[PDB]
Design a protein around this ligand. Structure first.
Ligand SMILES: *[C@@H]1O[C@H](CO)[C@@H](O[C@@H]2O[C@H](CO)[C@@H](O[C@@H]3O[C@H](CO[C@H]4O[C@H](CO)[C@@H](O)[C@H](O)[C@@H]4O)[C@@H](O)[C@H](O[C@H]4O[C@H](CO)[C@@H](O)[C@H](O)[C@@H]4O)[C@@H]3O)[C@H](O)[C@H]2NC(C)=O)[C@H](O)[C@H]1NC(C)=O
Ligand SMILES: *[C@@H]1O[C@H](CO)[C@@H](O[C@@H]2O[C@H](CO)[C@@H](O[C@@H]3O[C@H](CO[C@H]4O[C@H](CO)[C@@H](O)[C@H](O)[C@@H]4O)[C@@H](O)[C@H](O[C@H]4O[C@H](CO)[C@@H](O)[C@H](O)[C@@H]4O)[C@@H]3O)[C@H](O)[C@H]2NC(C)=O)[C@H](O)[C@H]1NC(C)=O
Ligand SMILES: *[C@@H]1O[C@H](CO)[C@@H](O[C@@H]2O[C@H](CO)[C@@H](O[C@@H]3O[C@H](CO[C@H]4O[C@H](CO)[C@@H](O)[C@H](O)[C@@H]4O)[C@@H](O)[C@H](O[C@H]4O[C@H](CO)[C@@H](O)[C@H](O)[C@@H]4O)[C@@H]3O)[C@H](O)[C@H]2NC(C)=O)[C@H](O)[C@H]1NC(C)=O
Ligand SMILES: *[C@@H]1O[C@H](CO)[C@@H](O[C@@H]2O[C@H](CO)[C@@H](O[C@@H]3O[C@H](CO[C@H]4O[C@H](CO)[C@@H](O)[C@H](O)[C@@H]4O)[C@@H](O)[C@H](O[C@H]4O[C@H](CO)[C@@H](O)[C@H](O)[C@@H]4O)[C@@H]3O)[C@H](O)[C@H]2NC(C)=O)[C@H](O)[C@H]1NC(C)=O
Ligand SMILES: *[C@@H]1O[C@H](CO)[C@@H](O[C@@H]2O[C@H](CO)[C@@H](O)[C@H](O)[C@H]2NC(C)=O)[C@H](O)[C@H]1NC(C)=O
Ligand SMILES: *[C@@H]1O[C@H](CO[C@@H]2O[C@@H](C)[C@@H](O)[C@@H](O)[C@@H]2O)[C@@H](O)[C@H](O)[C@H]1NC(C)=O
Ligand SMILES: *[C@@H]1O[C@H](CO[C@@H]2O[C@@H](C)[C@@H](O)[C@@H](O)[C@@H]2O)[C@@H](O)[C@H](O)[C@H]1NC(C)=O
Ligand SMILES: *[C@@H]1O[C@H](CO[C@@H]2O[C@@H](C)[C@@H](O)[C@@H](O)[C@@H]2O)[C@@H](O)[C@H](O)[C@H]1NC(C)=O
Ligand SMILES: *[C@@H]1O[C@H](CO)[C@@H](O)[C@H](O)[C@H]1NC(C)=O
Ligand SMILES: *[C@@H]1O[C@H](CO)[C@@H](O)[C@H](O)[C@H]1NC(C)=O
Ligand SMILES: *[C@@H]1O[C@H](CO)[C@@H](O)[C@H](O)[C@H]1NC(C)=O
Ligand SMILES: *[C@@H]1O[C@H](CO)[C@@H](O)[C@H](O)[C@H]1NC(C)=O
Ligand SMILES: *[C@@H]1O[C@H](CO)[C@@H](O)[C@H](O)[C@H]1NC(C)=O
Ligand SMILES: *[C@@H]1O[C@H](CO)[C@@H](O)[C@H](O)[C@H]1NC(C)=O
Ligand SMILES: *[C@@H]1O[C@H](CO)[C@@H](O)[C@H](O)[C@H]1NC(C)=O
Ligand SMILES: [Ca+2]
Ligand SMILES: [Ca+2]
Ligand SMILES: [Ca+2]
Ligand SMILES: [Ca+2]
Ligand SMILES: [Ca+2]
Lengths: 388, 388, 388, 388
């Protein structure tokens, strides 16, 4: 086994094709399925695995009540092969209400945060063993990506924030080798608030596209230079913006360095990446809430804060169906690195009062250099008919 | 791991021996089992896998109501080892209301079609990743085999159809190397309508025996040449025809070039293969309905359209129980390529109104050069006793 | 991977140590467990597998009614790693209401029989593909061992019977190389009725201890020469006799060549093996019924038929508890071949009328050259409480 | 594949990081989970496994009543990958009401004990086959570690006891090569009563921290020389003692050689290990019943029976919640050997009478040389809302 260098060009992309659906909730009206949230996908060199933070309970289960809650000691990171839904034989790989995993070509790294809000613990687990742990530095909800980390030449990076959800917070980038935190750069550049980054390998370094929970409804970018541990940061220029909430298509605007100050509060995890001076991005369809899910290309949207020219729209989930978190992952082809993404399909509380639980299912698309059509692929469960 | 070439002669066949039964429905009365239809069987160099098209629901499950429906955004392609019923630990390999799959000696190809009726998308998945996709070309229910594809020297082939189900349609044959659509030949020859081909290797090409849904109760044949991509086609000469509905044995007739025009409309997926000038074929035992299942050799049935001389019959499913789709697969023996087939045993709606769902189980026989006896192997669930 | 030769001295045995137990019936009151009968154990070079004949149903399932029946089309051979109870992810490896399996060092052979009572088919499955089959020869319930077969230098041997359960039946021994029947030898020597042979390797031959459903309460021995395919047969001399029914310890007697004629009608599958001129053997504790199980050694039990001198008695299952079929299998130690055995633990109809089903769990013991104690390991379910 | 030698220095330990939690009781409220007690953790070179002792029943079952009982013939030793809950497809690896396991580099070894209280039997199962067995010597409950054994150069040591739980009793140390009992030295030194040892490699020997159930709330230490098979023994010096029950912190005293005589009756399985002349150790928070769980470092606590200076306290389970047995396991890193530990979270009878069953879940923590914070990880099920 050799370490992944990811030293290949990005695959040509014309949009994304259908790849996976798990049907989790539909399956839990007549099965034993875990209650989850903040799912994501990552792949070893052969195949892809789906992750989630469980709630330490199944759905048809009295312990399902009040699983809207985001941190409990009973939360663990679930790991299955992609498209094997989270059944009772599912492996909980570490204790965590916040997590990030990646495979460096030789083994899996997992980053797992659990414990008190003010004194949380991050564990670093590699080749099935604990190798390290750092402590919460600002004492306010140590948290990480909720999607895959990236590993170049055996050096894996992960972005972590401790701090205010609504003011300056303390963001750091760790560099992990065979499970050991070898360096710790602190955030730099113009990004003013950073959360749940969707990172991808852009040789010779790593690029991430994040959530700004404070004053931006445009999206932070982070460059990460893997050799000298340096960081620069900014915002996704595209005048069509990827956070939720945000203003409508006619009003909005963006900046290449600063938060647009537009409904900037709150947000949703999301993803975008670059194709020359253009930008591929996904986002919710509804501008203020977590309904529907679209991707597209904005022409010159990577390098022009004034561009609002989308081509290649694809509806993933239609505006009548709930979406949620979403992130990126990278798959290595014979000739190129492909970009793929997942979409958390949230059901239940607080938005849906037909039940007492909160959970998700998931849908995964992958870039293609070929052709595709339309469709829609929601969660498809009926809550009025669900275990009451 | 070298590519499969299948460059061994077809095994001496005196008939078929019992190979596999999954018992899916009876089990789903006392366990959480997937609702499925359109199963098939394919096998890697070491062992055999069963596939099927899930309904994103288990049987004892409120979402099972209405699963008679062909295309939903929740249908996914399920894959287990042969004889492992579709339990909740079953992997979904892609989103699909129409698929095919083959292993090429090195890795699995899946051809998965999902999306809108008028704008379907086919994804091509190889060695664990999306490598390609085509849109619907005629915008009228893009569909493929519902059984194994075939790969020789690392080029795999699949047959797809877009367009009318009761008039001329647009059938193409795709050639695929490591998940990459490398050529697209268009259908040619006498065959006038084509659906759901059951293809076998037959060095140095591939042979398919399909379903004409338009004016044929005789079955289409499709020859595929692999090195130059040329396609010819015709019908199965035998005067005892393989489709359902059809005319009875005294009344029916056939042609080697055109459809026969006898109850030709509609159909069922089925299979045949040649042995010199003789034809082995399975079919249903009722003329108009998917009841029972039989197999036999029609002597000179591959090259004389008047021949109705059948020998070596066997009742696979007795005339009073339910059959359905049926297809071939080829298994590489020590000295020869053998031929086997599964039979979909469809139960429930709309033919059976004791329940609200529609599902299948399966039985599998394999070619034998040895000896054998008689029996019947239906689904054997009581729908009078099933889930509410 | 080399073939098994089994060419090592047989291990020293002082009695048997506990090895495995599946508590299947106990689990089936709070889980989905297969209904089975006629279980057995066979090991690959690395580890053991547990086998059984299914009823195409789990226990908490409406279809479990009249699982007393011994031949339906819904019966399959189930195969798990030893210890892993028959849950829904259990593989059904072939269609069988009578089976025998065994690993030759390179791959598994399975010998499965299904079909009509008067025309059944035995399928031979090797390295995951169908390689041969044979028709019933006497048209009267073709059956086989219901426990492991034995393979030497890549030649496997299995004993099958077809014919009357209460008169002269037609017993044959097959030699199967890589799934292919290379020879069929008919039964020879002095044994007058043969069924359900528990066979073990004994370099260079194979040897089997069987059941006489006809006139014997002593046990047929069959002896198979693997190179020149010769058969002899006789009975287990021991005045202590292993079949059930039988006369009591004081009243019973035996014979080295003929059936004792003492309560010979009916029987049970059991086992024995030589230890110089002595015999180790198991049997039900009760004379006329399938209650309790015991093993002991009988000094000069292999060669002198007047001997009734037992020693090293062990109670495996106490006399107030149900037992059943039992059979031998051999595990290869570093320097010698060990000998182990399984006791079927039958619960349900028609002996126990509290429930409508008929199922079993199992317990497994292995030869030791060490010291051991006492105990009793029954099935331990309470049927006064099981489903309905 | 070479034997494990464990010939690396012990890793720096500043404390413990969260590693795994299995949430077994909460899951059993809506899913089929085994009833277990006396769980523990051991790892092959690649990955860890959670073992436990099954009550031969799942939780939602009639057979779960009276699982408070310690020894029945339905108990088996369960084995899953760490973080995979004891679901229906979990392997039962041998019959055991008391057990121990280690991997020696090449394969697994299981020491399992079952049978009559006064004539128990212990089976030694190595690389999937029974290699040995010894009877109960003092005919008063042969029992063993209930946590991992330890192997060095392919020789495994395990500690067993036969005799009184409140008096002199007979402890022995077995030395096992590939499942073969090669030698047996008996207990020697000032250790007066020894049970349930939590052992760990300490090249070139093995050391163990045990339970004294007779006169000592300090914990026996046992040192095992692997080369001359010689045994010394004593007690953990630290003034804060590891047993439950015990006196409070201002009353407690120890002794390096003899039992303290302080509420010395009864006990709980627990662990400690040396770090220079300091000791690392865990224990229940509450001094007299199994409530809460804590770990800390005692400065000079390994060598000075007067030292009561603890540093680095961590609460694993808060004092409102239930703990139980806890043991140690060792994990080989690149440079050094890490120490880890599990905690049993016992729920139900006798202490809690809302339900009729007794079962557990586990939480697991690992040595770290990095940093950490606080938290509490109880079992977290609601027995009020549990199955009747
Ligand atoms: C089968 O499926 C295919 C593939 O998904 C569909 O083709 C896509 O259709 C979408 C939707 O129309 C296209 O996305 C849109 O592109 C527009 C640009 O289109 C033209 O204009 C420019 C500039 O003059 C030309 O250069 C270019 O060649 C085009 O002719 C954008 O304007 C769209 O954005 C606007 O529309 C959406 C609604 O669609 C609004 O909600 C937005 O806010 C915005 O106002 C959008 O980006 C996409 O490019 C097509 N892709 C491909 C590869 O063909 C087929 O339509 C479908 N077939 C059927 C029968 O449904
Ligand atoms: C035990 O199991 C074996 C194996 O399955 C059975 O043997 C098979 O039996 C079937 C059914 O009879 C045979 O198939 C039939 O072949 C007929 C050919 O007739 C003759 O063929 C030659 C010479 O002509 C002779 O060798 C032979 O003796 C025959 O007399 C076909 O005409 C049959 O088709 C017609 O009948 C069926 C109903 O049976 C109709 O439904 C058809 O539409 C059609 O009108 C039929 O195909 C088969 O060849 C046998 N195989 C072998 C290997 O022997 C035994 O039947 C079974 N035994 C018992 C006692 O149950
Ligand atoms: C702890 O566990 C061990 C191992 O299981 C037990 O020791 C075994 O005890 C059994 C039962 O008594 C023994 O089996 C019996 O052997 C007898 C041999 O006769 C004597 O001769 C030998 C050698 O000459 C002497 O060493 C010895 O003293 C014997 O007395 C047979 O005669 C017995 O058969 C009769 O008894 C049984 C039931 O008791 C009847 O059902 C039969 O029909 C028959 O009439 C019997 O076979 C066995 O050999 C012992 N094994 C070993 C290895 O020593 C301990 O008993 C047990 N301890 C406790 C307290 O339970
Ligand atoms: C975030 O997370 C970390 C990690 O858990 C916490 O830091 C630990 O805090 C605990 C609890 O206080 C510390 O353990 C305690 O250590 C005392 C040491 O005494 C002093 O002396 C040293 C130098 O000799 C100084 O460095 C230190 O500042 C101390 O003043 C022990 O004496 C304590 O034992 C007594 O208290 C406990 C209750 O705490 C009683 O139950 C005992 O019986 C006894 O009376 C105690 O064990 C631990 O050392 C810290 N570890 C580290 C690495 O710093 C943070 O507290 C936490 N932050 C927040 C805000 O929660
Ligand atoms: C269990 O099986 C028996 C036998 O199949 C069932 O009893 C038979 O039911 C049929 C149709 O209802 C009757 O015509 C017969 O008279 C019955 N036969 C016998 C031998 O009794 C019985 O109903 C089944 N039990 C359940 C609960 O379904
Ligand atoms: C569901 O839970 C509601 C809110 O309960 C709160 O959160 C839970 C997890 C507990 O910690 C509890 O003490 C809190 O009050 C309840 O009001 C409601 O009764 C529950 N519903 C059911 C059906 O149990
Ligand atoms: C079962 O469904 C019946 C009709 O189904 C209709 O079409 C499909 C696509 C469903 O999604 C459904 O919502 C539509 O109404 C219903 O009329 C009937 O009430 C249903 N029965 C039960 C028991 O739920
Ligand atoms: C639960 O069990 C109680 C105690 O009975 C004991 O345990 C069972 C398993 C048997 O071995 C019995 O002979 C023992 O005395 C019962 O007294 C009680 O009723 C049981 N409760 C229920 C609900 O079944
Ligand atoms: C967009 O939002 C603003 C609300 O601030 C509104 O004035 C404007 O008309 C909206 N435009 C459209 C096209 O919805
Ligand atoms: C956004 O979401 C809410 C959900 O209640 C809906 O009522 C509103 O109309 C949506 N608006 C748009 C423009 O999609
Ligand atoms: C077959 O059925 C049709 C009825 O439409 C008829 O042409 C013919 O007479 C039938 N043949 C036999 C043998 O019944
Ligand atoms: C075919 O099936 C139908 C439906 O029950 C039946 O009524 C009919 O008689 C069958 N036809 C023949 C020829 O057996
Ligand atoms: C054995 O059975 C016979 C009946 O044939 C009876 O007379 C005798 O008492 C029995 N002997 C023993 C030892 O049970
Ligand atoms: C067998 O059971 C019967 C009662 O059904 C009993 O009388 C007979 O003696 C039993 N044999 C033994 C050895 O217990
Ligand atoms: C410890 O636990 C016991 C058992 O319930 C309880 O009575 C007692 O109050 C506790 N003691 C302390 C000091 O917390
Ligand atoms: Ca925002
Ligand atoms: Ca259930
Ligand atoms: Ca047709
Ligand atoms: Ca008999
Ligand atoms: Ca004590």
């Amino acid at each position: 086994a050799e370490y992944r260098n990811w030293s290949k060009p990005q695959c040509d992309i014309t949009g994304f094709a259908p790849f996976s659906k798990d049907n989790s909730i539909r399956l839990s009206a007549g099965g034993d399925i875990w209650v989850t949230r903040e799912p994501y996908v990552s792949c070893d060199p052969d195949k892809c695995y789906q992750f989630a933070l469980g709630q330490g309970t199944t759905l048809n289960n009295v312990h399902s009540n009040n699983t809207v809650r985001g941190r409990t000691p009973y939360r663990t990171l679930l790991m299955n092969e992609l498209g094997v839904p989270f059944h009772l034989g599912t492996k909980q790989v570490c204790i965590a209400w916040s997590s990030s995993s990646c495979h460096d070509g030789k083994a899996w790294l997992h980053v797992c945060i659990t414990g008190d809000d003010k004194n949380a613990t991050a564990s670093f687990i590699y080749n099935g063993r604990l190798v390290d742990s750092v402590v919460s530095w600002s004492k306010e909800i140590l948290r990480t990506q909720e999607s895959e980390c990236v590993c170049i030449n055996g050096t894996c990076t992960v972005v972590m924030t401790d701090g205010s959800a609504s003011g300056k917070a303390d963001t750091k980038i760790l560099f992990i080798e065979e499970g050991k935190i070898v360096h710790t750069s602190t955030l730099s550049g113009s990004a003013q608030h950073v959360e749940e980054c969707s990172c991808y390998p852009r040789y010779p370094g790593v690029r991430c596209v994040c959530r700004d929970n404070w004053k931006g409804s445009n999206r932070p970018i982070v460059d990460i230079n893997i050799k000298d541990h340096s960081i620069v940061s900014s915002y996704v220029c595209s005048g069509l913006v990827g956070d939720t909430p945000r203003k409508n298509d006619s009003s909005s605007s963006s900046h290449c360095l600063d938060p647009n100050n537009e409904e900037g509060g709150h947000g949703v995890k999301g993803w975008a990446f670059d194709d020359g001076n253009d930008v591929w991005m996904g986002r919710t369809i509804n501008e203020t809430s977590r309904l529907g899910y679209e991707t597209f290309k904005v022409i010159e949207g990577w390098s022009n804060p004034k561009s609002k020219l989308q081509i290649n729209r694809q509806v993933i989930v239609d505006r009548g169906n709930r979406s949620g978190y979403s992130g990126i992952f990278s798959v290595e082809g014979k000739s190129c690195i492909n970009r793929c993404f997942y979409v958390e399909l949230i059901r239940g509380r607080k938005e849906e009062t037909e039940v007492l639980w909160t959970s998700n299912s998931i849908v995964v698309f992958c870039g293609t250099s070929g052709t595709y059509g339309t469709g829609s692929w929601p969660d498809g469960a009926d809550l009025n008919l669900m275990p009451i």
